[PDB]
Design an enzyme around this catalytic site. Structure first.
Site, PDB file in Angstrom:
ATOM      1  N   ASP C 105       0.845  -1.184   0.000  1.00 34.65           N
ATOM      2  CA  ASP C 105       0.000   0.000   0.000  1.00 34.65           C
ATOM      3  C   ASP C 105       0.883   1.237   0.000  1.00 34.65           C
ATOM      4  OD1 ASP C 105      -2.437   1.260  -0.161  1.00 34.65           O
ATOM      5  OD2 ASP C 105      -2.783   1.293   2.005  1.00 34.65           O
ATOM      6  N   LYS C 107       0.136   5.343  -0.503  1.00 32.60           N
ATOM      7  CA  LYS C 107      -0.650   6.529  -0.797  1.00 32.60           C
ATOM      8  C   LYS C 107      -0.273   7.620   0.198  1.00 32.60           C
ATOM      9  CE  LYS C 107      -4.619   4.271   1.464  1.00 32.60           C
ATOM     10  NZ  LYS C 107      -5.307   5.253   2.343  1.00 32.60           N
TER      11      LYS C 107
END
Lengths: 46, 135, 270
Positions: C105, C107
């Protein structure tokens, strides 16, 4: 075990979630000032 | 890193364990690696001889599974074998036991590949370490 | 919650959890964070267990990247600052990739920053250890717009190359001030990748047609120039981004190969 030790270090019994003792300065802030990660809950496994 | 290890192999001569491995086909739930990791967890927790048993095995295998396997379903299949007939509401206090084991090893579940291969470097003749999946 | 240290002058945070079993994502987050000590990665100081409730302990950075990027649409970010942030991210990610870690992940809300000009990785909840071979992998991994194409299509045993892509999608974001691929859904977002970066082919990719989701009904788009899609970047910036985002995972530049890129000649620590 380790929770009394963690209590010793982090100046807190984990307790009420907001007591204090000393040697650390503990606050309670508004969620809006935190960078979204610290009040971020877990995630659904699905 | 320690030469005894013999109390750990004693579990695999057990019945429920043997049949549990026979149940395991493609080595999804118990890999030769996961069965090494379940040992590494035994060392990290510093178990006594009295402390290796059926429940303390499955409880570690479930942890190694939830850590190293992204498939989140198959690992549930351990429950009927460990907890008997009704695990249905008896699985949660098993989960808290897993969390306690995690508390005992000081939270490091992660075991490197080389460290996994080094604990099977002792007696490679053992059958466990010939069980491996592919594709 | 929050905290303050009258001695050593540091600040930390709580982030509690709390009902029939501990989450499988938290186990990974914690177990991985305890094995990773890096200046460019958020740390984990201590983890407790009490009955109904579990608290973590985290080094407290002042904000995340979005709210800092949302801080200025109007003005931009100084290019040296961007270079510093990206070099940092690539360094910590080099520490992650090289030893037994895939984040899966990336972001801006998972990227924390401070006033001292530092940026660190956060939220290892979806992260895992790729060291042990022949494992199982979910191919729904990173969040939305930052997804790699190979995982956007069917791919099994995806390597470290999936994080780099996300960083690219982060890179452009710190430049154009907006999102790179504002995908409304799966596919979709893929066709946006096809719009900006061009429609793939076997000249670019060896196994592109052998990917399961792939069907040759896809509209053919050419490759848009990196002057139009990301103007503020210099030739070095485009040079890095280009090999940072490419459909072939086997080509895609690693972290250690990124740190030495000519774009980083000017790297600083503002």
């Amino acid at each position: 075990d380790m929770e009394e030790a963690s209590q010793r270090k982090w100046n807190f019994d984990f307790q009420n979630h907001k007591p204090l003792e000393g040697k650390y300065e503990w606050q309670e802030v508004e969620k809006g000032s935190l960078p979204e990660f610290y009040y971020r809950p877990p995630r659904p496994p699905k | 890193q320690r030469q005894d290890m013999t109390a750990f192999f004693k579990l695999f001569d057990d019945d429920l364990i043997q049949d549990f491995l026979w149940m395991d086909c493609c080595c999804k739930i118990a890999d030769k690696y996961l069965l090494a990791m379940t040992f590494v967890y035994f060392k990290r927790a510093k178990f006594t001889i009295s402390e290796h048993t059926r429940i303390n095995f499955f409880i570690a295998l479930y942890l190694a599974n939830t850590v190293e396997e992204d498939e989140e379903e198959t690992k549930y299949e351990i429950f009927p074998w460990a907890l008997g007939k009704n695990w249905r509401k008896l699985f949660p206090n098993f989960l808290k036991l897993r969390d306690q084991l995690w508390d005992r090893i000081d939270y490091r579940a992660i075991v490197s590949r080389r460290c996994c291969e080094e604990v099977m470097a002792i007696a490679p003749t053992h059958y466990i370490w010939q069980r491996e999946r592919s594709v | 919650y929050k905290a303050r240290n009258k001695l050593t002058g540091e600040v930390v945070a709580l982030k509690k959890i709390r009902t029939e079993g501990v989450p499988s994502t938290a186990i990974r987050e914690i177990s991985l964070l305890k094995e990773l000590n890096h200046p460019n990665i958020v740390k984990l100081l201590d983890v407790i267990h009490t009955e109904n409730k579990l608290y973590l302990v985290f080094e407290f950075l002042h904000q995340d990247l979005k709210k800092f990027m949302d801080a200025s649409a109007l003005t931009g970010i100084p290019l040296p600052l961007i270079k510093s942030y990206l070099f940092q991210l690539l360094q910590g990610l080099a520490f992650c990739h090289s030893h037994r870690v895939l984040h899966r992940d990336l972001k801006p809300q998972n990227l924390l920053i401070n006033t001292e000009g530092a940026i660190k990785l956060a939220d290892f909840g979806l992260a895992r250890a790729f060291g042990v071979p022949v494992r199982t992998y979910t191919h729904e991994v990173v969040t939305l717009w930052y997804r790699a194409p190979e995982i956007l299509l069917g791919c099994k045993y995806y390597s470290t190359a999936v994080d780099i892509w996300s960083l690219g999608c982060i890179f452009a974001e710190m430049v154009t001030r907006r999102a790179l691929f504002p995908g409304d859904s799966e596919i979709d977002q893929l066709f946006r990748i096809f719009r900006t970066l061009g429609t793939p082919d076997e000249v670019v990719w060896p196994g592109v047609t052998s990917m399961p989701d792939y069907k040759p009904s896809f509209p053919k788009w050419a490759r848009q120039d990196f002057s139009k899609v990301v103007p503020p970047l210099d030739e070095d910036g485009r040079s890095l981004l280009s090999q940072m985002l490419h459909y072939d995972p086997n080509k895609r530049i690693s972290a250690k190969a990124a740190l030495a890129h000519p774009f980083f000649q000017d790297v600083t620590k503002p």
